Amino acid sequence: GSTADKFRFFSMARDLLSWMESIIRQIETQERDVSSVELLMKYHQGINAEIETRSKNFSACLELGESLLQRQHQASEEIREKLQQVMSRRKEMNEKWEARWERLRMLLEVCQFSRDASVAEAWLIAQEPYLASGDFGHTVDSVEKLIKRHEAFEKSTASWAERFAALEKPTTLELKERQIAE
């Protein structure tokens, strides 16, 4: 079983090493960058799903490797290194996935925030006609009507207080600066 076992171990490692390089390249390939709304959320997570599927394989590969090393197989050195190599490329894979995932949330802010702004900016342009008038009444009745119209107007204005209030609080982009700034 030794030669079969050894042979099988290296067969698994190789397969996992090839698959990782493929996935690591899969991460970097997509560009840095969605226009507005990111299907990249679905696309990037899908990758994680595939990673989970391999979970067993690693355990298998890793275990065999360990058992082989315990039993004083005399390819131990070659074995040790290949299993470091697979373990190294594993942590590196999840670091490079999570590394990016944080950023997917980061770009999420600008796309959302940017849109949030244009919508607000647009709405303020819209109110101009009303807010431009020089009519203030020439009669108790007329002014009473204008005040009530204004009362209605202000209330609807009031609604947006939250919407604008959200744009006040800063971004993770801008937050991270603390680490770059300090």
């Binding site: 600008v110 702004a117 607000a120 807010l131 009444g137 108790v140 202000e154 801008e174």
Partner: protein, 140 residues
């Protein structure tokens, strides 16, 4: 998405909102100013009308029939009361003008003018009621 730390210039492009809020506050304020002014004007004008109605009754010497003097004196006494109680409205308007349309108000001269027109009308009423009154006193 330009100079992403610099992006927040878009935030300063938000200041529109500050200019928007201020203009809302200004319109409301101006509407309030107009309200108080119009309300005043109407009350003043109405007081004017009221005075003239009395004045017309007093000068309608061109007459009805009536000749009972003691009673005539009662209708007259009752008229002086109406004037007295209404006099309170004159005071309130003067007070309102002094307090709500002070130096630093657009309608200072305009609201001072109305109160002046009424002071003049008021004098007229007083002269006429005093004169009609005096006749009756003399006629018993």
């Amino acid at each position: 998405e330009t100079a992403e730390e610099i992006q927040e210039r878009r935030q300063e492009v938000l200041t529109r909102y500050q200019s928007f809020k201020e203009r809302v506050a200004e319109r409301g304020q101006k509407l309030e100013d107009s309200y108080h002014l119009q309300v005043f004007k109407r009350d003043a004008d109405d007081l004017g009308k009221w005075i003239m109605e009395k004045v017309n009754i007093l000068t309608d010497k061109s007459y009805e029939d009536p000749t009972n003097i003691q009673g005539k004196y009662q209708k007259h006494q009752s008229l002086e009361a109406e004037v007295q109680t209404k006099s309170r409205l004159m005071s309130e308007l003067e007070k309102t003008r002094e307090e709500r349309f002070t130096m630093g108000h657009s309608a200072h001269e305009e609201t001072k003018a109305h109160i002046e027109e009424l002071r003049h009308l008021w004098d007229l009423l007083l002269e006429l009621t005093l004169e009609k009154g005096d006749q009756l006193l003399r006629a018993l």
